Design a protein around this ligand. Structure first.
Ligand code: NAG
Lengths: 32, 50
């Protein structure tokens, strides 16, 4: 009698996030 | 010699013979191997200047 078994499992994940919060406000009539 | 043999009978027993033999051989070999490895890397950076 002969018997053999083989199991394999692989999982891959890669997150990514990139904020950008930049504001401009200027007032010395003139306004910005 | 070939016609009359190399030896002759001087004595013995004329009875029956019963020889029983029960040879049994059994072998079993098992080998199991499991290997699992997991890795995780997580890194982030925030830089703000105003
Ligand atoms: C934005 O900033 C927050 C807090 O620092 C962070 O958790 C997030 O991963 C960033 N990126 C996004 C929301 O896409």
């Amino acid at each position: 009698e002969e018997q053999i078994e083989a199991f394999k499992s692989i999982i891959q994940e890669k997150t990514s996030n990139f904020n950008a919060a930049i504001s401009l406000k200027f007032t010395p009539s003139l306004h910005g | 010699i070939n016609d009359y043999g190399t030896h002759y009978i001087t004595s013995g027993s004329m009875g029956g013979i019963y020889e029983y033999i029960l040879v049994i051989d059994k072998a079993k070999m098992e080998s199991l191997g499991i290997t699992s490895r997991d890795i995780t890397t997580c890194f982030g950076g925030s830089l703000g200047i105003q």
